[PDB]
């Protein structure tokens, strides 16, 4: 029996790709269909060899090879919408590569994925990656605090947030990491109470905390 | 003062109730035997006295009476 007929009735969720190293890759799109396809190949009701690939798993696997053979590289994400010609989003304002070694990298990345035929490398701009991250964080009316340093920005969302400001701040981060990756810009949601809870303090460059009506505490300038 | 004598006399009846069960359950086990004539008071008072201190009585109503009035402990 064939592999596309050994899976379930709905032959729409899985996609069988003929590998080049005499194998056969099945491409699921979440972790529940990955275990649905791995149970068939693990109970052993198929003769030849086959593997189950994914989006997040294969994008985590190829960064271990790239963190050894190409360190200090500024990239974002590998996109697998068409699993035969994947797109590699590379940074523009941070690399020192000419047109020759980009073809060398596009051939060594092709040798890592036997199901693909050609790897397309497109150079995404570096400022719009934080411009979309700030403009999407302002439409949800969320308080935030941007920190700029070289090779990555950081948005801190703290304080006592209500239940609408947690549910709105989670659906945006999970919709942004899905299309940009967590390599460049990092969100830091941190639900905690207010510092100096019921204490009156005298802020700014010469500070104290009133522990009581007759008790002064002198820590760091609040 | 008339509301405190009223609020004390209906607490003392609730306190009265278990003891009546005790001296009605020890006086009826004698009549099941051939003890129709012996006095049950001299048997009722030790079996009522060793149970109240073993179940810590005088530290249970001294707490429960002051809890009505003030924030004790």
């Amino acid at each position: 029996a064939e592999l596309d007929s050994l899976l379930g009735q709905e032959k729409e969720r899985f996609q069988v790709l003929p590998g080049r190293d005499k194998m056969l890759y099945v491409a699921a799109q979440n972790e529940r269909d990955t275990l649905w396809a791995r149970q068939v190949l693990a109970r052993g009701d198929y003769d030849k060899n086959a593997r189950v690939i994914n989006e997040n798993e294969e994008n985590k696997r190829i960064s271990i090879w790239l963190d050894t053979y190409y360190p200090q590289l500024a990239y974002y994400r590998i996109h697998f919408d068409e699993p035969r010609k994947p797109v590699f989003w590379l940074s523009r304002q941070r690399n020192t590569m000419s047109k020759k070694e980009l073809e060398v990298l596009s051939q060594k990345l092709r040798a890592l994925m036997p199901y693909a035929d050609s790897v397309n490398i497109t150079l995404m701009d570096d400022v719009t990656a934080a411009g979309q991250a700030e403009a999407g964080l302002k439409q949800q009316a969320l308080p935030y605090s941007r920190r700029n340093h070289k090779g990555g920005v950081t948005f801190v969302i703290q304080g006592a947030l209500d239940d609408v400001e947690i549910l709105r701040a989670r659906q945006f981060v999970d919709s942004y990491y899905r299309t940009w990756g967590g390599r460049y810009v990092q969100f830091a949601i941190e639900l905690k109470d207010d510092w100096l809870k019921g204490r009156s303090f005298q802020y700014g460059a010469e500070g104290y905390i009133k522990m009581s009506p007759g008790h002064w505490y002198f820590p760091s300038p609040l | 003062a008339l509301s405190e004598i009223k609020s004390a006399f209906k607490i003392g009846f609730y306190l009265y109730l278990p003891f009546v069960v005790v001296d009605l359950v020890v006086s009826s086990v004698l009549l099941a035997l051939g003890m129709m004539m012996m006095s049950p008071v001299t048997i009722s008072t030790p079996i009522k006295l060793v149970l109240f201190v073993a179940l810590d009585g005088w530290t249970l109503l001294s707490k429960g009476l002051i809890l009505q009035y003030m924030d004790i402990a």
Binding site: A1, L6, G8, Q9, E10, R32, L35, W36, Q39, V40, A42, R43, G44, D45, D162, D163, V164, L167, R168, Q171 | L67, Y69, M70, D71, I72, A73
Partner: protein, 184 residues
Amino acid sequence: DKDLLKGLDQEQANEVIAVLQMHNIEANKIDSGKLGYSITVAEPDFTAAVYWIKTYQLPPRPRVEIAQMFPADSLVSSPRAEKARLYSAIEQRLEQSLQTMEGVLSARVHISYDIDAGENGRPPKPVHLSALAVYERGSPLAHQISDIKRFLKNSFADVDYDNISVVLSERSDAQLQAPGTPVK
């Protein structure tokens, strides 16, 4: 053909089957009359079915409630026991009333318990509520959080909008196709 669980009841067996069937293994429920149900799987699916029994903590234990620790059959009942049997029937009636809304499939409500305010002369504290919910997919579940707050605010004496926390989520993907018998 190998058995992995016997003696289960009806609600336990229908939640062991519903867990195994989404992981591409097929189970068989066998009644035995007085001794309860029993669940048997095939021979290649035994190493995986034991792994999901261990991971998912199956069979499900019965769900506990506060009103069971203080039964109403005792001869004496402390006011801590009468207040604990009252708040545990209010938080059951509130979650049975949340399922009659538009789109809610399951819910779970928790109330803060205050028991020591009545024994001595201390004033009572404020009362806190917390809810969970599971919604039908396709629903805008960001604006569904204001109706559960408005419903929960004046079902007690005096709460605020800062003492109510609602955490709700859409339901999982539907499982409709058969698992598949292993060929040999």
